[PDB]
Amino acid sequence: MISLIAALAVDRVIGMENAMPWNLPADLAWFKRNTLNKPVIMGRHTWESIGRPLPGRKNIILSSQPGTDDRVTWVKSVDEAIAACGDVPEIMVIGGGRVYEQFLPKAQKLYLTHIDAEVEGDTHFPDYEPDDWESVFSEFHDADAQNSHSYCFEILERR
Ligand SMILES: NC(=O)c1ccc[n+]([C@@H]2O[C@H](COP(=O)([O-])OP(=O)(O)OC[C@H]3O[C@@H](n4cnc5c(N)ncnc54)[C@H](OP(=O)(O)O)[C@@H]3O)[C@@H](O)[C@H]2O)c1
Ligand SMILES: Nc1nc(=O)c2nc(CNc3ccc(C(=O)N[C@@H](CCC(=O)O)C(=O)O)cc3)cnc2[nH]1
């Protein structure tokens, strides 16, 4: 099964100038929990943003050009990226905006963190059709001394 995981600020903003304009340790811990020991597919810009491999995950990078780091796997299309995952129970697509748009139709599951932050952005999560999805998990957290925004972890399943 293909899943998308992403954290969205207001207006579905997910990035600005190739970075995520917030700092939420608890959301990065959620990302790690829900991705460790699964393949992760990302676009080249997200690869550059993260800046290093995510350990304990097969990292698959989409790029039209030859790869530039053999610590990760490089592929040139959506279907090649899926194939490179092999026979696994769940493939995690970890962005960015352009990659999320292409995997959305194939995805059966969304793991979305809805962060209460106002962020100028230049990259968005897709404007997906809400009627396609049923929320099956939802957990809101107030801001605290480590996490400067409130946020809500939600899992949605394709109806
Ligand atoms: N908040 C979150 O949850 C979250 C998650 C991930 C990323 N982000 C943010 O999102 C931003 C990056 O997103 P982005 O939309 O600019 O870029 P992206 O989706 O990460 O990367 C796009 C790149 O991937 C390659 N690619 C995409 N689809 C392909 C295909 N079908 N075949 C071959 N190559 C393909 C291309 O590389 P080539 O140009 O080499 O062909 C392309 O330029 C950054 O700000 C980042 O911090 C936020
Ligand atoms: N919910 C969610 N939050 C995100 O921050 C997020 N980030 C990406 C892309 N960018 C990043 C940036 C950093 C790390 C990262 O440093 N995570 C480490 C440590 C996690 C922790 O500190 O607890 C990891 O091992 O996953 C992951 C993805 C994709 N989907 C997301 N989805």
Swiss-Prot record:
Function: Key enzyme in folate metabolism. Catalyzes an essential reaction for de novo glycine and purine synthesis, and for DNA precursor synthesis.
CDD domains in alphabetical order: DHFR
Protein name: Dihydrofolate reductase
Substitution effect: residue 16 to F/S: Increases catalytic rate about 2-fold
EC number: 1.5.1.3
Family: Belongs to the dihydrofolate reductase family.
Coiled-coil zones: none
Natural source organism: Escherichia coli (strain K12)
Domain DHFR, first and last residues per copy: 1-158
NCBIfam families: PRK10769.1
